Design a protein around this nucleic acid. Structure first.
Ligand SMILES: Nc1ncnc2c1ncn2[C@@H]1O[C@H](CSCC[C@H](N)C(=O)O)[C@@H](O)[C@H]1O
Ligand SMILES: Nc1ncnc2c1ncn2[C@@H]1O[C@H](CSCC[C@H](N)C(=O)O)[C@@H](O)[C@H]1O
Ligand code: NA
Ligand code: NA
Lengths: 371, 282, 371, 282
RNA sequence: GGCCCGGAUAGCUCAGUCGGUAGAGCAUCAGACUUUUAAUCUGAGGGUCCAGGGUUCAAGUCCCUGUUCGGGCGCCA
RNA sequence: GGCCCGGAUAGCUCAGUCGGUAGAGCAUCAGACUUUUAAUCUGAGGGUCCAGGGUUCAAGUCCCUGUUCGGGCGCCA
């Protein structure tokens, strides 16, 4: 509802995001500045802030002659009548920032000769650098997926956010499902699935190594209640499972987590052996073909599965091998492109076309095998 | 069925999706005594469908066969009877995530149209959420209500027959999200604000023409909406084929085959621009 | 300048093109109609026409209540108050067409209730079907490349017109060059090169089989003067050339073409052996790698080459093998996408994004080999 | 040099393009007594460049080396000193074909800018064609004239320093093609018509914003231009890499590597819309 | 008796239960060849989707009817 | 003496003459393991591009200066 201490949140400046957990008297960095989160509390989400010595303060939410052509605008380099030295002075003097903008404008001889559009642009460029405003927002798949793709794309195998959206839809992720997921995307795909399941149903997460990565998952700030239906099971035991050939004070604490984790692994192994799962989602750094050919056996007939891959070629193989194995229908190899737009009066156009570096998807439905 | 929960076995009243080969499909309402003809033969529901599990290969007539699939919004979108142009799953996937829809979400929509987006929303917000949709065309409104009853999702949706641009969505300050697919969405922005909770929520409008987007963005800004973003998502679909390019004859006495992902169409069309925004108190 | 008999031309209806050679008293088909070109002469290019019994006539170049919503528009199917039978009657009666449009509008009960935009759209759709207008235009690479991509894309290996444009530019095709080309694109690439060379310089066309295909080339209507610098040489003799191991009344006519073609082949072989060509253009159904590895030897240092392929994978190999061979720099594997737009008041948007089915390009510059 | 004809050997006054590895390049004016520093060492023109053939590997200083390439408009576009934003070769390729430029063509252009498009046009229309370009900024106009003289292409181009929207191109009814790259092209449409031959010709305008396109198309239609088409061309460039995805550990005791064409950038930007049209008598 | 499905683009005729309709064959023409009122091999030219109407937003993966080819159910809707 | 080139993103430090700067290493943390003021292996967390100014259309593959790391020429610009 409103911001509180301990809350997982996301900081936003312009289109740049950084997720952090709020803590009294903790220092964090964001876009070349040092913060103290203490002050941001009891405020609604979407609330803005500005930085000072080390503390944030709450600012309001909201806050003419010109030329036609640049035919006579010459770049002498001497349009700004205050120096690179003077500039630090105003800053070190700790002045507002908006007044520094106003000062730069007043000391620009060319500003008045510029077009209105060039003026607007000049100002927006200055405000961006001097009027640093930080908004605090609530975590969501939308915000976190956009953040990760921009901040740590290598950690999520370059899965663009529109691609993640397609996976949730193609896999008919919803409340009540029993889902299987194998992800090395920092737990972002898991978190996205958990958001769309709302604490209803179950998820069995197959993990490589010594445990599942859930750093991204933690950023969502899910209630403990969402953990009850969350299971994990080591990927290196999967082959056994399909054949049925599957089995001072801290030295104690370990034994306590080891048997407890062994316990949970057996529950998960049972749920898997029912071979009645409602879907399968795969998105990892590993070659997907063997993962699919094995993990599908855990999935019930007439259920959707979706495999992500940063590269197309492996999905071409996976497509062919699924067609040899049988047990699937409506196979679809797809990709999404995403274009964003600047929409302003007399200044509307596309910005970026995100293409090829957002991944590929292979999807379909399971069916009964021939006998 | 149900659209909202997986069931093992086909039963009467179910909407079943038949896969006929290639990508071709047809939706069928399962009734005792009913017959369905396909290019692969006849299906007699009472023996060939009813009682049988989804995902099964069903023999039809002269040894012909089909697969029967459990209904989902995505499959329904590809098989529903159009009463309007509809949104497809690529746009719907993005709309769903960017509106932050989840179980428990309360959503306002206009226009209901053919219910492609409606079923996706219901699937997403069930079992605790609710959809308040608006359609000013009498017959399309009623057809939508009929389908919602047939598909057993009436609990999660209320259709109101009225002009969203004049009378709004029929609720005030209850919604987490508003979705618009109408010709003049800028006239509904104020009503979108009134429909969303006081604590805030998300907005999305779908427009084919850039001038519609422009008007929408202007109205959003004026009303106090923030975080405006206009996006377009473009699906590309690939055929998997093996190709071999013959070696040239240079007079001599490597050119090995390869797997390729070739686009199914040489051109990808434009559906619409998607404009998102946020409502926050202040 | 103006249209004349014997002229190679292109017919246009809406965005559909068909190229033909004008001939007195010859019958040709275009978009479901039968013509006689006799009448279209002495007219400027860009001039319009309409069809009749079998002859074309010159028409001029150039030639309000409504609702807001469709909320009350019902599809009874009975909006048009004249029958599918009546319709042929007006046509068989050979009436104008514009009057049939006017009649359909007058007998549409819903037309007046439709939006202005829907009205405009309704009319444009009727005019398209009843007011068939044929424009005659001059051949150009632009028109012919667009035509081929739409009408016979399989004949040009799905080379989209924007892709062809990139090839001409990347290959620095211009007057004075000595160019080498290997094309199985019906002679369209050859024609494009000939347009940009303007009769200055030389082109050596390597052909498979018994001769070079130049059907598209003929559509350009080049003067005989452009043929003097046009040479051909069989591709199956290329290996010999690089090693230097290269050599009643109609039965006469043959011998006359055979020795004349042998003659031209020797000239071409000489020009090639100079190994001083100003560029190389390849676009065929054949695997490109061996063509490139051989044909580059004919090219001088510091010269651009461009290889087209409908598929990316073979260019990946060609890239790697060029890097093993050496003798190249600034290698670039590229593709263009093309989007077109509807630009009308309050109705502006993209139409089609042409992607993936327009081909790929591998380009670079030659350099001196290490010795 | 020359820009207009290939020559075997580098000579004084030539613009030479040095390739420095990767895609990096620099343009140099070859003068006796001149030196050029690169990351690979020094080049002394009088011995390292002059007299030597284009395409040669040139040793620089401590055994470092570079390749020297013959100038072309495409290479110049990537190495010229910007005085404005410029058009790149992907747009220029389409502009050139769609305007039907060829040897002998007479072309009108505004604004000259930094001469990226100018050099491409000259290369295309030589030796018989001529370019009449217009630039209302005094210094940019003169800088362009200087470059045209340095590159020995002054024969094929006339730069006029004036406002194309008021005074037009400085010629009337001589051009086969008009190209516009200015902020307010709709104000130059009438002058474009006057500049093109009476018998007709082609028109193209480059605009970043859709509202500029809209105004242009409206003015074109009103003036009598036909065959209006608005296009956008988007370059995609690929790195060729071998990748290997590690096999998963399922506890067992194919995943072979592959060549891939990966985009160099995850996003392709927008340069401008290109609007074409035709002038015909009537 | 009727009902339900699926198809119509090249001069003619076809095209697959892998989400296979710009892919072909016949015929025609040309080269080569020999067997010459001609054969054979190779290759080339030929494509915008059956007509009409109604509807969707100002984007059709929309609907109805007619023509014609085909498949299926059974005297039932 | 000066001049010319090339680099600055993670807490720190690097990154290739194939048109190789979201790629890493160090360190830190966690699992596993044994050798335990700890080692080893495996893995994870950590990225928005050095500051300031000026300019291009209403899209930068743009320019200048300052800080600092490096390369080169030579007392010449
Ligand atoms: N002002 C208005 N109030 C209510 N409905 C409106 C409206 N303007 C247009 N509509 C309705 O909006 C619909 C647009 S088509 C909507 C399709 C829908 N998104 C789907 O996927 O199925 C039409 O049915 C139209 O009747
Ligand atoms: N009305 C006008 N008359 C003449 N030049 C104009 C003009 N309006 C703008 N310009 C000029 O147009 C140029 C646009 S930048 C042009 C860049 C050019 N296409 C290139 O590739 O190099 C600017 O130099 C500007 O001075
Ligand atoms: Na036919
Ligand atoms: Na650093």
């Amino acid at each position: 509802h409103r911001i509180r201490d301990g809350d997982f949140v996301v900081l936003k400046r312009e289109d740049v995001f950084k997720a952090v957990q709020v803590q009294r008297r903790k220092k964090v960095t964001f876009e070349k500045q040092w913060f103290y989160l203490d002050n941001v509390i009891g405020h609604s989400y979407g609330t803005a802030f500005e930085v000072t010595s080390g503390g944030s303060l709450q600012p309001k939410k909201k806050r003419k002659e010109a030329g036609t052509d640049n035919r006579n605008i010459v770049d002498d380099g001497k349009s700004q009548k205050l120096t690179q030295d003077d500039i630090k002075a105003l800053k070190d003097k700790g002045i507002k920032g908006e007044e520094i903008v106003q000062q730069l404008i007043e000391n620009s001889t060319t500003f008045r000769d510029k077009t209105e559009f060039a003026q607007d642009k000049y100002i927006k460029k200055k405000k961006k650098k001097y009027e640093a405003i930080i908004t605090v927002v609530k975590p969501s798949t939308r915000i976190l997926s956009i953040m990760y793709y921009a901040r740590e794309p290598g950690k999520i195998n370059h899965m663009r956010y529109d691609t993640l959206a397609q996976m949730l839809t193609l896999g008919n992720i919803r409340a009540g499902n029993k889902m299987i997921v194998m992800e090395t995307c920092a737990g972002l795909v898991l978190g996205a699935m958990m958001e769309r399941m709302g604490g209803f149903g179950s998820i069995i997460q197959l993990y490589p190594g010594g445990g599942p990565v859930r750093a991204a998952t933690a950023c969502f700030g899910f209630p403990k209640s969402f953990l009850s239906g969350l299971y994990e099971f080591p990927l290196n035991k999967v082959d056994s499972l399909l054949h049925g050939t599957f089995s001072k004070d801290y030295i104690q604490e370990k034994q306590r987590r080891q048997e407890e984790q062994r316990k949970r692994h057996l529950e998960a192994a049972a749920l898997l052996s029912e071979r009645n799962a409602d879907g399968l989602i795969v998105a990892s750094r590993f070659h997907p073909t063997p993962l699919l050919l094995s993990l599908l056996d855990f999935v019930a007939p007439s259920r959707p599965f979706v495999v992500y891959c940063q590269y197309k070629e492996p999905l071409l193989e996976c497509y062919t091998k699924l067609r040899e194995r049988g047990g699937v229908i409506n196979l679809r190899l797809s990709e999404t492109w995403l274009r964003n737009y600047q929409v302003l009066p007399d200044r509307s156009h596309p910005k970026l076309l995100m293409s090829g570096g957002g991944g590929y998807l292979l999807s379909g439905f399971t069916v009964a095998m021939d006998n | 069925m149900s659209f909202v929960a997986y069931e093992e076995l086909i039963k009467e009243g179910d909407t079943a999706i038949l896969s006929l080969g290639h990508g071709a499909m047809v939706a069928v309402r399962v009734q005792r005594g009913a017959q369905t003809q396909t290019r692969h033969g006849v299906l007699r529901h009472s023996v060939d469908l009813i009682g049988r599990p989804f995902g099964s290969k069903v023999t039809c007539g002269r040894g012909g066969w089909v697969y029967v699939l459990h209904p989902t919004p995505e499959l329904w979108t590809l098989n529903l009877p159009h009463r309007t142009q509809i949104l497809y799953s690529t746009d719907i996937a993005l709309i769903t995530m960017m509106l932050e829809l989840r179980p428990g979400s309360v959503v306002c929509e206009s226009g209901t149209g053919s219910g492609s987006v409606s079923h996706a929303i219901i699937r997403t917000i069930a079992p605790t959420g609710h959809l308040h949709t608006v359609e000013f065309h009498q017959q399309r409104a009623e057809k939508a209500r009929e389908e919602f009853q047939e598909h057993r999702v009436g609990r999660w949706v209320t259709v109101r027959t009225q002009d969203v641009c004049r009378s709004g969505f029929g609720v005030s300050h209850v919604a987490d999200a508003v979705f618009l697919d109408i010709p003049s969405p800028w006239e509904a922005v104020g009503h979108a604000w009134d429909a969303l909770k006081v604590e805030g929520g998300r907005f999305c409008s779908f427009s084919p023409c850039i001038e519609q987007v422009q008007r929408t963005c202007q109205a959003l800004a004026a009303r106090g909406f923030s975080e405006l973003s206009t996006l377009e998502v473009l699906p590309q679909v690939y055929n998997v084929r093996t190709v071999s390019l013959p070696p040239p004859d240079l007079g001599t006495g490597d050119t090995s085959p390869f797997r390729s992902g070739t686009p199914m169409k040489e051109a990808v069309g434009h559906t619409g621009y998607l404009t998102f925004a946020t409502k926050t108190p202040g």
